[PDB]
Amino acid sequence: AALSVRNLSPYVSNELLEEAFSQFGPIERAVVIVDDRGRSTGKGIVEFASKPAARKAFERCSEGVFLLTTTPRPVIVEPLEQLDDEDGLPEKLAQKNPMYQKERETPPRFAQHGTFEYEYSQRWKSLDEMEKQQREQVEKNMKDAKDKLESEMEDAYHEHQANLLRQDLMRRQEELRRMEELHSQEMQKRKEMQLRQEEERRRREEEMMIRQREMEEQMRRQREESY
Amino acid sequence: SEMEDAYHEHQANLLRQDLMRRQEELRRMEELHSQEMQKRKEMQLRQEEERRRREEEMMIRQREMEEQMRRQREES
Amino acid sequence: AALSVRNLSPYVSNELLEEAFSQFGPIERAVVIVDDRGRSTGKGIVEFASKPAARKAFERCSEGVFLLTTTPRPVIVEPLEQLDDEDGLPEKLAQKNPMYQKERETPPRFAQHGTFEYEYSQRWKSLDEMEKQQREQVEKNMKDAKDKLESEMEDAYHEHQANLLRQDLMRRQEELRRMEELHSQEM
Amino acid sequence: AALSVRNLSPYVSNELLEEAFSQFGPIERAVVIVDDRGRSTGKGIVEFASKPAARKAFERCSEGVFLLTTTPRPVIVEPLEQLDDEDGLPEKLAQKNPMYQKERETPPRFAQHGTFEYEYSQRWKSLDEMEKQQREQVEKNMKDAKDKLESEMEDAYHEHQANLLRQDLMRRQEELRRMEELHSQEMQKRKEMQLRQEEERRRREEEMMIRQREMEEQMRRQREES
Amino acid sequence: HEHQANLLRQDLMRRQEELRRMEELHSQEMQKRKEMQLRQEEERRRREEEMMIRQREMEEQMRRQREES
Amino acid sequence: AALSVRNLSPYVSNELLEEAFSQFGPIERAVVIVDDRGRSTGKGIVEFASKPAARKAFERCSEGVFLLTTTPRPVIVEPLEQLDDEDGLPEKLAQKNPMYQKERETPPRFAQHGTFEYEYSQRWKSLDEMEKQQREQVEKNMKDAKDKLESEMEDAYHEHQANLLRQDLMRRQEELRRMEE
Amino acid sequence: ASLTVRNLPQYVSNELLEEAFSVFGQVERAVVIVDDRGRPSGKGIVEFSGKPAARKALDRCSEGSFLLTTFPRPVTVEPMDQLDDEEGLPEKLVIKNQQFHKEREQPPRFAQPGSFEYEYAMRWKALIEMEKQQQDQVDRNIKEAREKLEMEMEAARHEHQVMLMRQDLMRRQEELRRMEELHNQEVQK
Amino acid sequence: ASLTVRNLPQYVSNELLEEAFSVFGQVERAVVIVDDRGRPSGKGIVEFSGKPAARKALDRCSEGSFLLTTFPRPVTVEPMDQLDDEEGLPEKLVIKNQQFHKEREQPPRFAQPGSFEYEYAMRWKALIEMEKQQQDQVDRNIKEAREKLEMEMEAARHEHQVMLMRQDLMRRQEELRRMEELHNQEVQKRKQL
Amino acid sequence: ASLTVRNLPQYVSNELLEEAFSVFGQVERAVVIVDDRGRPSGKGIVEFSGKPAARKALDRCSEGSFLLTTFPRPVTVEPMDQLDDEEGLPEKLVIKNQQFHKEREQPPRFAQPGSFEYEYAMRWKALIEMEKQQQDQVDRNIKEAREKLEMEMEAARHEHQVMLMRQDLMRRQEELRRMEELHNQEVQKRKQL
Amino acid sequence: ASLTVRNLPQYVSNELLEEAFSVFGQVERAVVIVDDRGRPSGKGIVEFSGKPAARKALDRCSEGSFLLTTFPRPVTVEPMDQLDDEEGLPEKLVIKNQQFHKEREQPPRFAQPGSFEYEYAMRWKALIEMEKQQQDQVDRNIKEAREKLEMEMEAARHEHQVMLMRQDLMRRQEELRRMEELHNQEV
């Protein structure tokens, strides 16, 4: 139950790796491959206790995105392929080819200048050099692409923050416009009601005043007659 | 011997009658003015209660408008 | 049959107010309302056995004048208002209201600076302050008017005595004038 | 047939108002009222020679907004009220009502200390002073409001420009987003098509390679036979 | 000498005959491989032609959808 | 009834071509293409009165091999392609289709820097350069092949004559061996 | 020398102002301002022959209450402002500084709706209309106060008349008592 | 040591009053005055455990604005005026001085019309009627002002909401601009070096 | 002073060549070669008047990109190569050196299968045939490249449209920010004084 | 001292390597890497007893072309890359300075979709998918070239046999002609 882990930061230790994938299952032994000089190779193999834990990790990391560090470097996992260096391809397994016995007849040599084997070995050498060149070119392009991504941490981070803030501000502006228009309508209705009430009040007051002045005139007339 | 006393009594009686007449006129003016004032006061009270009734009715109409207005705001 | 009677002098009694008003009916109980220091507040309470008697008392002291002191300050009666300070409004009646439950959802607070509630509590405080000023002004005007009516307690009495004396002298002089002219035309 | 325009700028003059209001009709006289020093009073009178054109101008400046100067000071128009200065109310017209004659019977005077006329004139004078205070209050309130509204000459202009720009930028961003999404769909479908194409080419090339292998094998057989 | 010259000429004749046989078998080699290569080039050219016609119809369809939208 | 003749020697003439293809039928006109300087272009055209005569000439030089020169240079004949020089495509025929009108509306120009037209025209021009270099490569290859195959002219004749001498000497040896025994 | 007598009585004449203010000096011209229909506007316009007479008149009618007729409403007297519409605004008399050019960048014209000019002109028009509402409110307040003060004239008139009668009676009664007591004390001695 | 609370909200309880005022201290008994027909009278009575807590509550409710429901109407708190309506004023508790004697010069009876006492009594009664009219006028003034302030419940609420939220939006816009220019100058200096 | 135009647009008339190259100078004649059917060969010959104008058009189209219609395919212009089928090679024109007599040992005839001329003509014909196959291979390569370019035209057009409009949006956003901040510090420096 | 040999033939064995690579000096062990199923992988591993022999072997199998079978496919020899999967980089081995502290700011957990972290998750995943595509394309090109070269084997062998036989024949014929003419001129 081993799952291949790669594209991992050079600061994650063995134990950080074992803690990160612990949530998928038990960790019998989690190790990141290292080279002679001691730096982590960025690729690791982690051994899980149970087959279902490894399969769950592979799936959930396949559809989802797993992370391990502050730097958003998603972890990509693939099933391991097992290789062996102490046991090779022994003869009892090897002699079984009918033609291998008749193929070995030539001793392994370096060919000779002018013979066909040498003249064709040169063509195979040219093909191998072309393959090496193409692999080097891909590796260089990629290192360049990863360095370009590393440069753009701050810019796109700030851009994301600014976009979120601008969207929030736009939402608040829309709410402000809605409240403003509704309040203005509210005030217009209140003002209309107030002016209607004022007109009614003025008319009623004029009526009461005309009655009062008529009553005063009658009092004055009766006073004059009594005099 | 009763000359100065006779003149004094005559003048005092004349001005006492004058004062009595003026007092009667003052009483008449007082009562008439108080009647006028009372009529104006009752007119003021009647107009005031009519104003109160109109203002109360206008206020309940404003209340009804306000509650319907808030009901519309809640619905939207 | 409770009558809220006020405008009385500080020298009245539980006895004087129960000897004066005993004419209208039997005395259930009449008490003067006194503050903490015991000095009369100038009011009282009077209740009667039969409500018919108390209503007659109200109408008589309303249309007429009931005076209880040598100093002529009338006794003014009104029906007594029923207010109780123990059985406040109960929850079984308070909660029947549908909007009460959504009215208490906000806890009793103190408003907070800048908030709308604190911005409006200041307008309410201003209204309360101007109401306080108007009430104080009315009370001081009544102090002035009553202390004035104390000042002309004696001057009005003397003027009234003088007026009755002068009317009596006028009547005497008119009668003597008629008698003298009668005797003159007799001669 | 005249209109009373007001709210004028201090720097307007006769001919500016003559040429601005001439759009609606002919002009005979249009004078901007000036005080004793000649300084602009902010008001003018425009007496049209034509009544219908004057009414059209009144309406169009009423519902519409008219200006006279870079600073947005709208010019407001009301019909003029005529008051006759050097003629007034003669004696004969007044004496038509007989009751005027019992008003003049008391000669003009000053009122006298203690007389009822004095005690009343004092109340009238208190009312006049209160009215004067109210008028001064309104004048000061509107002077403050106008002086304030002059202060936002540039702030409101800046806000309007910024709003036009942000709306333009918003619709630009919307158009950009639409183009991005549509073109991304274009590219995705092109990519899937070419993937299918090269897979088919791959299978055909493999079948080709097998044919040439069987050629080589059969030919090796024949060469061994010969 | 004549014997040795005759042996050398005989060896040369045998070697010319062997060379001629090898050359003619290689001539059949080139004939067969070359004709198959032309056949397969024709097949691939035709396949690419019907490959390109499909791209042309996709392009015209996608442009029609562009104009409709 | 015309044929386009190529692979001609530098020292061919009009009359040489006329008399070479005259065995195949009557000639009307056969001329040799020459450049501005009048140098031989190695091409030519032969025109025959009757189409079947042209067909027989074409086939006879196709399956057969026909020489004009002591140098064994073959002649390759293929049907000539007719292209009118002075009468192009009239505009009236151009307007027949509905695409020319909707296609012409943009005037001739030169593209502007930064425009898509300029950017894409640059790729078109790069393709043109690639095509031209490929054509020059193929032309240089055939220059090499011609110059080479002219070099073994004497050597091939010498080895052919030596081969004939070896064969008839061998048959003489065979008949003498049969005679002596 | 001009004045501007305000709050005139309801029933006035040119010669009423010519005679009443003749007290303070010579009135060359006093002509109640009259509108088209012929009704009085409610203001006056008086011109004296000299300035010092006018200043004295302003001071007296300010500290005093120059009643005009029997209706006890004094006339408010204020100095007149000289609104000139003869010379108007000649073009060559304007300052024509850089401010004129700053204000004459663009010609008189309407405001295009939705622009900045129209949006700002809305604010100015709202300000002007609110000012007009305030002025009409002041006019309404003064009118209602004036009508109230005209209604209660009879009450105050009769109140003061009664008070004068009562004080006069008190004075007469005190005179009676004093003279009687003086006579008694002198005859006794 | 008992205070009085006034201007209670429309929907109040003994419990609302004691739970609301318990923050200043322990409330021995808070009650809400009610009339006979179950309608609230708009007044309260609260008694704390002693002088210090009550004085603190009085000061804090005077200088503060203690709301006790969602309706923004603070309660005015005033010390209670106890009125002894049991002991009254017994004869033994009167000073019974010569002022008492000259007060007791005529038995308490009606004033016969047309005498001096009747005219003076009418003067005092007219004074009392004028006082009652003044008190009703003040009550009416306060009622009209209260109805005016109750109408502006919603207009003031919405205006304050709009103003507060517009200020919040302006603050957010300034924060965005400050952060954006900050980052711009950071990256400018960092690319320059 | 004639010029020829190559890889001409598919839809074209004589008049397009007449007027399109008129910018370089006066054009006496302009023709678009057509086969017997009506499908023009994609080549065109323009008759100029002046040699300096011909040189100017040639090098201007060389370094420039003469786009002739909305289809963004520039036309490649090369000098016309003059071929003369009229004069030919009259017998007197031939130098008639010793090479010609050596070139004329035998009259033009066929080749007998088996004689050295035949096995050498076979080698020549094989060389010619491999040349023809190579030329067809180059034609096929260019055809399959130009079809791919015609396909990619639309994607390139849309990508350039997007790039231009995004750059314009960025420029105008920067302009907005510039104006806003500038107004900010100018109002600040006005208010501080 | 270890070396990795690539492109071993289709039919390879342990003693095939031990004997072929023993010419360069004594060796301890060489193996042919095999997949789990049991098929050859096309890669080798060869170890030595010291540096100089292994370095000589690398130099010769680089400048030379070591065939180890009739099939003319020379091997590629490089130095084996020693990768350790035991020690890792434990805590007492990491630098643990401020470089790690900002690295160790979040726990290892999934990125929230529609966020900045998820956005770079998508970006890095697209980059890695492009890497897989490009490496596959390179392997594809090499596979087609290898198939073409393997098919041109027999044709090239026969062409070279013809060329060598023709050169031998020219030399022998020239020798015979010279030996004829020298004898004729001698006698």
TrEMBL record, chain A:
Primary place of residence?
nucleus
Gene Ontology terms: biological process: activation of innate immune response; alternative mRNA splicing, via spliceosome; chromatin remodeling; chromosome organization; dendritic transport of messenger ribonucleoprotein complex; double-strand break repair via homologous recombination; innate immune response; negative regulation of circadian rhythm
Name any GO cellular component annotation: dendrite
Entry keyword set: Activator, Biological rhythms, Coiled coil, Immunity, Innate immunity, Nucleus, Phosphoprotein, Repeat, Repressor, RNA-binding
* GO molecular function terms listed in the Swiss-Prot or TrEMBL record: chromatin binding; histone deacetylase binding; protein homodimerization activity; RNA binding; transcription cis-regulatory region binding
Q: Where in the cell is it found?
A: Nucleus matrix; Nucleus speckle
Q: What is this protein called?
A: Splicing factor proline/glutamine rich (polypyrimidine tract binding protein associated)
Shown chain mapped onto the complete sequence? 367 to 593 of 703
UniProtKB/TrEMBL annotation, chain J:
From the Swiss-Prot or TrEMBL record, give the protein name: Non-POU domain-containing octamer-binding protein
Any coiled-coil ranges, and where? 128-187
Full protein: residues contained: 149 to 335 of 472
Every copy of the RRM domain together lies at 1-82
Which compartments is it annotated to reside in?
A: Chromosome; Nucleus speckle; Nucleus, Nucleolus
Quaternary structure and partners: Monomer and component of the SFPQ-NONO complex, which is probably a heterotetramer of two 52 kDa (NONO) and two 100 kDa (SFPQ) subunits. NONO is a component of spliceosome and U5.4/6 snRNP complexes. Interacts with CPNE4 (via VWFA domain). Forms heterodimers with PSPC1; this involves formation of a coiled coil domain by helices from both proteins. Part of complex consisting of SFPQ, NONO and MATR3. Part of a complex consisting of SFPQ, NONO and NR5A1. Part of a complex consisting of SFPQ, NONO and TOP1. Interacts with SPI1 and SPIB. Interacts with RNF43. Interacts with PER1 and PER2.
The gene it comes from is Nono
